[PDB]
Design an enzyme around this catalytic site. Sequence first.
Site, mmCIF file in Angstrom:
data_model
loop_
_atom_site.group_PDB
_atom_site.id
_atom_site.type_symbol
_atom_site.label_atom_id
_atom_site.label_comp_id
_atom_site.label_asym_id
_atom_site.label_seq_id
_atom_site.Cartn_x
_atom_site.Cartn_y
_atom_site.Cartn_z
ATOM 1 N N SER A 51 0.784 -1.196 0.000
ATOM 2 C CA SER A 51 0.000 0.000 0.000
ATOM 3 C C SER A 51 0.834 1.273 0.000
ATOM 4 O O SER A 51 0.261 2.380 -0.037
ATOM 5 C CB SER A 51 -0.932 0.005 1.213
ATOM 6 O OG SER A 51 -1.919 -1.032 1.158
ATOM 7 N N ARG A 229 3.899 -1.200 13.416
ATOM 8 C CA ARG A 229 4.746 -0.488 12.484
ATOM 9 C C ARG A 229 4.922 0.943 12.967
ATOM 10 O O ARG A 229 6.041 1.464 13.045
ATOM 11 C CB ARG A 229 4.131 -0.498 11.114
ATOM 12 C CG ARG A 229 4.005 -1.877 10.543
ATOM 13 C CD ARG A 229 3.102 -1.933 9.307
ATOM 14 N NE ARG A 229 1.751 -1.538 9.636
ATOM 15 C CZ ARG A 229 0.701 -1.628 8.816
ATOM 16 N NH1 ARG A 229 0.832 -2.032 7.549
ATOM 17 N NH2 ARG A 229 -0.463 -1.148 9.239
HETATM 18 C C1 LIG Z 1 -1.653 -2.269 1.823
HETATM 19 O O1 LIG Z 1 -0.477 -2.496 2.070
HETATM 20 C C2 LIG Z 1 -2.720 -3.277 2.197
HETATM 21 N N1 LIG Z 1 -2.097 -4.543 1.790
HETATM 22 C C3 LIG Z 1 -2.648 -5.420 0.929
HETATM 23 O O2 LIG Z 1 -3.820 -5.303 0.581
HETATM 24 C C4 LIG Z 1 -1.920 -6.657 0.557
HETATM 25 N N2 LIG Z 1 -2.233 -7.468 1.483
HETATM 26 O O3 LIG Z 1 -1.971 -8.641 1.837
HETATM 27 C C5 LIG Z 1 -2.420 -9.036 3.162
HETATM 28 C C6 LIG Z 1 -1.296 -8.920 4.196
HETATM 29 C C7 LIG Z 1 -3.606 -8.183 3.636
HETATM 30 C C8 LIG Z 1 -2.853 -10.478 3.046
HETATM 31 O O4 LIG Z 1 -2.610 -11.321 3.947
HETATM 32 O O5 LIG Z 1 -3.447 -10.763 1.999
HETATM 33 C C9 LIG Z 1 -1.025 -6.806 -0.668
HETATM 34 C C10 LIG Z 1 -1.013 -5.911 -1.774
HETATM 35 S S1 LIG Z 1 0.156 -6.324 -3.030
HETATM 36 C C11 LIG Z 1 0.607 -7.650 -2.040
HETATM 37 N N3 LIG Z 1 1.621 -8.523 -2.555
HETATM 38 N N4 LIG Z 1 -0.100 -7.805 -0.880
HETATM 39 C C12 LIG Z 1 -3.035 -3.064 3.690
HETATM 40 C C13 LIG Z 1 -4.301 -3.739 4.195
HETATM 41 N N5 LIG Z 1 -3.131 -1.651 4.034
HETATM 42 S S2 LIG Z 1 -2.283 -1.108 5.264
HETATM 43 O O6 LIG Z 1 -2.414 0.249 5.656
HETATM 44 O O7 LIG Z 1 -2.573 -1.849 6.460
HETATM 45 O O8 LIG Z 1 -0.824 -1.415 4.874
#
Ligand SMILES: *C(=O)[C@@H](NC(=O)/C(=N/OC(C)(C)C(=O)O)c1csc(N)n1)[C@H](C)NS(=O)(=O)O
Length: 243
Positions: A51, A229
């Site tokens: 993200s 984080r």
């Molecule tokens: C943004 O980083 C967003 N992350 C994602 O949607 C991805 N998620 O994977 C998770 C960890 C949720 C899973 O287990 O499926 C992702 C995008 S591209 C990639 N390879 N994985 C999160 C939810 N937003 S944030 O603010 O918490 O980081």
Amino acid sequence: MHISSQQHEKAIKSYFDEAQTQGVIIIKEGKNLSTYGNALARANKEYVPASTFKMLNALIGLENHKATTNEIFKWDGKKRTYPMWEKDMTLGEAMALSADPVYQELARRTGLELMQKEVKRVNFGNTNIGTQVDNFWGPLKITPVQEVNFADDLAHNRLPFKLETQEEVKKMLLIKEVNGSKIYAKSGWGMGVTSQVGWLTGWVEQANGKKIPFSLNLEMKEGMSGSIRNEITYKSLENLGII
Ligand SMILES: *C(=O)[C@@H](NC(=O)/C(=N/OC(C)(C)C(=O)O)c1csc(N)n1)[C@H](C)NS(=O)(=O)O
């Protein structure tokens, strides 16, 4: 702060050790990168941006007139992974909530072709966004050093976008205010081949106008709250006297 560098390094290493993760936090002061944490070799390894890519998606969408900053993206009514996303919202609101459906819609408006070009032009990470415009933030990867430098660029308006596009996006990233210091940043959590990555990439803007960019990068494990984080980041900046 007559505190030794050995003591700073040990304290910040211990914030990662106590969270039972492996991670690094890169700090940039002027041109000088400092690397802290309990897994320093992470600094130049590549991870999906997840993200954190929303920062660049927003810059591209705005620069290219795919949206404005006050435009309301309507919730389409379908159930969402989180209730907080079941609502109509601006890009800026969607930044804070890391709301994917909004940033996906924006990516679709931009379209794969223009997104490709624009990611190459900005030379973000390894610069490959593949064949899917809304699922790519694999095979796009980026290193923590490359993230802190991107943060450095944006904080000083050096990316190749209009100044006002950059200021518009920066306004979206304010996540905290501590003792006259402001923290701009975006979080990330990606699933990779066999491991999860956590990010918090941004900059501290100090009372006096000085900007100090940072990128935290770590392994997320089943059970962890995301706000670890933030907590590791704030403790580290504080230990360094940066906030
Ligand atoms: C943004 O980083 C967003 N992350 C994602 O949607 C991805 N998620 O994977 C998770 C960890 C949720 C899973 O287990 O499926 C992702 C995008 S591209 C990639 N390879 N994985 C999160 C939810 N937003 S944030 O603010 O918490 O980081």
